[PDB]
Amino acid sequence: EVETFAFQAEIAQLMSLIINTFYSNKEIFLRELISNSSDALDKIRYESLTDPSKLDSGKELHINLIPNKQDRTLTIVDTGIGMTKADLINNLGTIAKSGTKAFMEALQAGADISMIGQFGVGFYSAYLVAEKVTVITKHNDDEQYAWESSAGGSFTVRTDTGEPMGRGTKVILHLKEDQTEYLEERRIKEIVKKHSQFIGYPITLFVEK
Amino acid sequence: EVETFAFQAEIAQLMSLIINTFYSNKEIFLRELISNSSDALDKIRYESLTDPSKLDSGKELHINLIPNKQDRTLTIVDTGIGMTKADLINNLGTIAKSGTKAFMEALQAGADISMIGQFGVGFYSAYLVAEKVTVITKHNDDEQYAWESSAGGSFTVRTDTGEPMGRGTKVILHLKEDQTEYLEERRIKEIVKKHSQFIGYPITLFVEK
Numbered sequence: 001e002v003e004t005f006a007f008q009a010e011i012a013q014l015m016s017l018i019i020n021t022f023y024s025n026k027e028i029f030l031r032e033l034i035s036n037s038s039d040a041l042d043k044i045r046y047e048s049l050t051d052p053s054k055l056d057s058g059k060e061l062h063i064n065l066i067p068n069k070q071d072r073t074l075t076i077v078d079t080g081i082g083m084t085k086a087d088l089i090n091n092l093g094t095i096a097k098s099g100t101k102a103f104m105e106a107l108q109a110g111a112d113i114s115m116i117g118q119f120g121v122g123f124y125s126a127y128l129v130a131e132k133v134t135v136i137t138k139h140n141d142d143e144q145y146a147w148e149s150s151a152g153g154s155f156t157v158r159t160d161t162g163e164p165m166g167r168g169t170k171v172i173l174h175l176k177e178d179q180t181e182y183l184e185e186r187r188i189k190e191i192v193k194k195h196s197q198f199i200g201y202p203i204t205l206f207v208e209k
Numbered sequence: 210e211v212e213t214f215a216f217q218a219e220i221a222q223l224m225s226l227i228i229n230t231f232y233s234n235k236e237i238f239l240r241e242l243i244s245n246s247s248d249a250l251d252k253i254r255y256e257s258l259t260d261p262s263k264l265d266s267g268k269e270l271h272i273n274l275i276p277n278k279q280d281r282t283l284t285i286v287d288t289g290i291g292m293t294k295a296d297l298i299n300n301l302g303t304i305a306k307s308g309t310k311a312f313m314e315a316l317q318a319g320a321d322i323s324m325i326g327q328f329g330v331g332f333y334s335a336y337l338v339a340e341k342v343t344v345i346t347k348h349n350d351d352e353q354y355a356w357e358s359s360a361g362g363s364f365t366v367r368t369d370t371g372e373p374m375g376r377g378t379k380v381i382l383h384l385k386e387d388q389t390e391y392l393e394e395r396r397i398k399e400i401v402k403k404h405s406q407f408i409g410y411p412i413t414l415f416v417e418k
């Protein structure tokens with residue numbers, strides 16, 4: 001029950017650009033993923049203003065950052081709106097075809113990769129630091145699903161039978177071997193303070209034994 | 210058939226802060242309104258990816274900037290998703306209560322008014338330059354409505370019987386007497402180039418006789 005899909009040509013090109021372009025300022029991936037979490041949390045907040053039962057699947061609106069040096073993963077968990085299967089398949093609920101075109105045009109007019117989030121496709125900056133990304137998500141309207149991709153042109157979607165998440169999205173970054181600085185507490189804290197210090201939801205950096 | 214509503218206390222406080230705080234960099238209102246238009250256009254684009262009939266109310270996705278020196282108005286029109294009556298009443302589809310709290314906390318930790326858009330309430334920066342704002346909107350799911358407010362704690366909502374807009378939102382800024390620089394073509398072009406040069410939709414600056 002694992003379905004495999006091909007990325008649209010434009011998204012595959014975006015991912016190859018992110019993976020192959022020499023670009024040292026890789027830390028911006030975390031700003032972009034926290035930003036997407038903040039957007040998802042705003043969306044469930046806004047739905048709850050008129051239907052409070054939308055928060056029956058969890059009232060606390062927050063983001064957790066969980067490093068795991070044994071597994072070489074950094075995971076970003078939020079309790080936002082989550083995504084339906086259809087959203088996951090449709091480029092993680094982004095307008096990535098048009099976004100990708102508008103990011104490319106910007107790159108030719110002098111922009112740099114750190115501006116990716118202005119084009120709606122900041123999620124793909126995960127591939128600056130990860131060799132594989134796994135996205136586990138639960139929307140009130142749907143079941144819990146796991147999306148996954150090591151790039152190379154395809155992604156998978158399956159029903160997830162991991163731990164139930166209530167509602168929201170978890171992004172597991174399986175980091176490249178030379179990017180393990182992003183598991184160190186001091187480094188994560190430095191990046192959060194530098195780029196995400198005014199995000200309007202609590203961000204909890206877990207520690208490890 | 211005009212309904213009058215009171216702003217929530219936090220939003221009235223936000224508007225008073227924007228109106229009364231000395232802050233010279235007023236031009237950021239246009240960046241924030243164009244940004245909101247871009248978000249609205251992305252939302253209708255994303256809905257259309259799975260139901261193309263969503264664009265039966267207009268296929269072109271764009272933003273127009275229309276100055277009118279006779280009426281002393283600058284109007285920003287987009288063909289995005291538009292807002293329902295409920296959205297207009299619920300602070301123009303924003304999470305303005307929580308956004309306002311998180312903007313205030315940021316202001317006390319050194320942020321400035323130009324950062325308002327990071328808190329989901331950039332629309333209210335219109336009141337840096339306008340004594341009254343009128344918002345006309347049409348969502349595929351609803352009728353055409355006009356919201357209006359000269360601040361002072363209340364806003365109005367009525368069914369609009371102006372020109373039909375097909376779909377999207379029009380924000381009419383009735384500018385303060387000392388803010389008419391924002392009707393001059395060279396000034397608008399300078400601001401768009403400075404702050405909005407990579408927005409992924411065409412922005413057309415109308416001229417006047």
Ligand SMILES: CCOc1ccc(-c2snnc2-c2cc(CC)c(O)cc2O)cc1
Pocket residue numbers: 033036037038039040041078080081082083092093094120121122123135137168169171
């Ligand atoms: C420009 C943003 O567009 C979007 C589109 C969708 C989302 C949504 S809806 N539910 N989860 C996410 C989400 C998605 C991602 C990206 C996998 C994530 O990292 C964290 C999340 O909570 C957020 C931003």
Ligand SMILES: CCOc1ccc(-c2snnc2-c2cc(CC)c(O)cc2O)cc1
Pocket residue numbers: 242245246247248249250287289290291292301302303329330331332344346377378380
């Ligand atoms: C952080 C953004 O949250 C939002 C919330 C809602 C919107 C939406 S849905 N339809 N129109 C607008 C819109 C609303 C405004 C503001 C009146 C505007 O100026 C232009 C628009 O097209 C855009 C951003």
Ligand SMILES: [Mg+2]
Pocket residue numbers: none
């Ligand atoms: Mg945004």
